[PDB]
Amino acid sequence: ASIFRCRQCGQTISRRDWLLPMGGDHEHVVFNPAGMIFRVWCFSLAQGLRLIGAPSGEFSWFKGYDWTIALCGQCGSHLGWHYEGGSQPQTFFGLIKDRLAEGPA
Ligand SMILES: O=C1CC[C@H](N2C(=O)c3ccccc3C2=O)C(=O)N1
Numbered sequence: 001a002s003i004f005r006c007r008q009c010g011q012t013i014s015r016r017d018w019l020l021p022m023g024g025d026h027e028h029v030v031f032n033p034a035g036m037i038f039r040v041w042c043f044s045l046a047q048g049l050r051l052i053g054a055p056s057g058e059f060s061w062f063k064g065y066d067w068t069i070a071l072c073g074q075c076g077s078h079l080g081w082h083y084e085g086g087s088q089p090q091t092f093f094g095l096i097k098d099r100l101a102e103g104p105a
């Protein structure tokens, strides 16, 4: 139980070791404007994604941060968001926990 892969395809995405307490917890439960609930795990680092477009501050769940959609770079599944433009840290990834699979390295 050390690496996180895309649930839909198996692409390598992140690692347990890279979880990031933001505001004291790596886990944040949030809703978007369409009411969808997301159980977001914050990671300092991730790979295997494709970050789409340019950042936006609109509706940001994390104060001082702008976001880009993060798709699985292999299959296109929406795995979460990349956050930037903030402070301590400047950047991080917020990934949707139930869209990843955890397993051995
Ligand atoms: O921090 C974030 C990331 C993006 C997220 N978001 C969405 O999930 C979404 C769906 C549809 C229209 C607009 C949005 C939006 O801003 C959101 O609500 N906040």
Ligand SMILES: [Zn+2]
Pocket: 006, 007, 008, 009, 010, 011, 072, 073, 074, 075, 076, 077
């Ligand atoms: Zn995938």
